[PDB]
């Protein structure tokens, strides 16, 4: 809202650092079943509700 | 099967007094040794307008007897009181318009206003615009005085109760017609949310005991007992006689 609380920007900061794909070396690990980030979020596809 | 508008007013949510712009509580000066054995001299400094009140307010300034400071009391202005006028409150005071004296120490037929119902409750009788109180009697042993109230009733008050000489200013106000719903709108804008009024016969039966039917008609007698409750007291409450006054 361009004049945020810090508590809003801190959760906004967290969401950007989570906004990445899976690291590719994790898919090479032993007994690994993770194929992709199932918790990926977009600003266009899902609003994160404060 | 729904609570009616006359019941909903007691919850006091949207039905309160619109009291932002009002100048204060229009009371008398607190009854003390100055006003019980001699007098005290005030001074009008403003005749101001009170929001939602049809009567002007006189700001009368006194000196505090015990501390060096000025105490500003707010009076209802009497018709004839001006700015710059010395105002006397007490027992030994002189009868002029705007002076405050006990009811016992003013003669029969004196015209008073802002009259205490009990000695020292700072003004209860004759406070609307134009109204006044006439002293019609005295019982000096067991000090009381007989008055005529603005309704025409007869009341017996202590002779230590106070009053201000004169009528309350602003009289003749209701004699002017409002002419339109707009001037009713701004009168009640600064009082409280009682306006407008929907007729109960113009309703549905769930909302009012008068509503419903294929024609707008009351159905039962509009006169209801005093011994009824909320939801049934929608009409003429405890009426003695109805209709015009033609005998």
């Amino acid at each position: 809202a361009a004049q945020k609380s810090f508590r809003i920007k801190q959760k906004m900061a967290k969401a950007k650092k989570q906004n990445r794909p899976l690291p590719q070396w994790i898919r090479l690990r032993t007994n690994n079943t993770i194929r992709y980030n199932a918790k990926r979020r977009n600003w266009r596809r899902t609003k994160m509700n404060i | 099967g729904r609570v009616i508008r006359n019941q909903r007013k007691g919850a006091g949510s949207i039905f309160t007094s619109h009291t932002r712009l009002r100048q204060g509580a229009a009371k008398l000066r607190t009854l003390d040794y100055a006003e019980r054995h001699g007098y005290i001299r005030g001074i009008v400094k403003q005749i101001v307008h009170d929001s939602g009140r049809g009567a002007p307010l006189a700001k009368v300034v006194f000196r505090d007897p015990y501390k060096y400071r000025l105490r500003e009391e707010i009076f209802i202005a009497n018709e004839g009181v001006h700015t710059g006028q010395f105002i006397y409150a007490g027992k030994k005071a002189s009868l002029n318009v705007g002076n405050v004296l006990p009811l016992g120490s003013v003669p029969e037929g004196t015209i008073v206003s802002n009259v205490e119902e009990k000695p020292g409750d700072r003004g209860a009788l004759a406070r609307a615009s134009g109204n006044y109180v006439i002293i019609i009697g005295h019982n000096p042993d067991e000090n009381k005085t007989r008055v005529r109230l603005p309704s025409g009733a007869k009341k017996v008050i202590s002779s230590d109760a106070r009053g201000v000489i004169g009528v309350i200013a602003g009289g003749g106000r209701v004699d002017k017609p409002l002419l339109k719903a707009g001037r009713a709108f701004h009168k009640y804008r600064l009082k409280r949310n009682s306006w407008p009024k929907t007729r109960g016969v113009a309703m549905n039966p769930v909302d009012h005991p008068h509503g419903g039917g294929n024609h707008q008609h009351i159905g039962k007698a509009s006169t209801i007992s005093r011994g009824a409750v909320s939801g049934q007291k929608a009409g003429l409450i405890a009426a003695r006689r109805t209709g015009l006054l033609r005998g």
């Binding site: - | 009868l95 002029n96 318009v97 015209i111 602003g170 003749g172 002419l179």
Partner: protein, 91 residues
Amino acid sequence: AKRTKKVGITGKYGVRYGSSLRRQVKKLEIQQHARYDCSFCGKKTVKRGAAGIWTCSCCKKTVAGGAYTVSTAAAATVRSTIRRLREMVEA
């Protein structure tokens, strides 16, 4: 000229509100908008200042009054009655 025969100040209300009610307001709008003669300075400079309030434009002195006229007939009687009762008390 003489623009209206009878409505006068009440021509702002048009044809509305009834002719009785326009006549009823007319005598009080003339009464509330007139300049009145001051009792202190003597000049005709008293106008209404939110009903019951009558400030004189010169001498800056405000008189509590009636709603539409400076003194009501009812409070004229009070000035006669209280003056009589003041003399017969201090007689």
